[PDB]
Amino acid sequence: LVESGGGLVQPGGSLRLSCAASGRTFSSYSMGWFRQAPGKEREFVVAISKGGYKYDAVSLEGRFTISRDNAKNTVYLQINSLRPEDTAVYYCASSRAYGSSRLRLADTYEYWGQGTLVTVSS
């Protein structure tokens, strides 16, 4: 898995990240985004099931949405209304698990990318 799109962005703007997977088995995985902000433990961000259904983090205020394009082996994270506290390394992960509350847990996932840094600053 390879995440892309990180950079320096102004508060209030939006940013789209993507993650591309190798191989032929992309459609067989649910995909989840997590982040590691400086000085914090890993946080679940948002996930998408094999069928395309969104699973939101229990406290991230709806600002993070997700889509997948199976023909391109790619999943997308859209962050709206960026805040300084969104500064973090963002990771995407794959799991064979079906859509359920387990998609909000890191241990459910089998493969992880190397991450992409998002910095939000005025």
Numbering used by the authors: 5 to 126
Quote the study on this structure:
By rationally engineering the surface residues of a model anti‐VEGF nanobody, we obtained a series of anti‐VEGF nanobodies with identical protein structures and VEGF binding affinities, while drastically different crystallization propensities and crystal lattice structures. Anti‐VEGF proteins have been the cornerstone of wet AMD therapeutics, and approved anti‐VEGF proteins include ranibizumab, aflibercept, conbercept, brolucizumab, and bevacizumab (off‐label use). Here, we successfully changed the crystal lattice arrangement of therapeutic nanobody (termed mNb‐WT) by rational mutations of surface residues, which remarkably reduced the dissolution rate of protein molecules from the crystal into the solvent. In summary, our findings demonstrated that the protein crystalline form can be modulated by rational surface mutation without impairing pharmaceutical efficacy.
We dissected the molecular structure and crystal lattice arrangement of mNb‐WT by single crystal X‐ray diffraction. mNb‐WT protein molecules were arranged in the P1 lattice inside the lamellar crystals with two protein molecules as one asymmetric unit. Up to a 1.27 Å resolution, we could clearly see the participation of water and sulfate ions during crystal packing in the solvent. Water molecules mediate a strong hydrogen bond network to stabilize two protein molecules inside the asymmetric unit (interface a). Meanwhile, the sulfate ions also contributed to the protein stability in the crystal lattice, both by affecting the protein itself and by enhancing interactions between two protein molecules that belong to different asymmetric units. In addition to sulfate ions, water still played an essential role in contributing to protein packing in the crystal lattice to various degrees at the contact interfaces among the asymmetric units, such as interface b. Because of the small size and compact structure, mNb‐WT proteins were tightly arranged in the P1 lattice, and the Matthews coefficient was 1.76 Å3/Da, corresponding to ~30% solvent content.
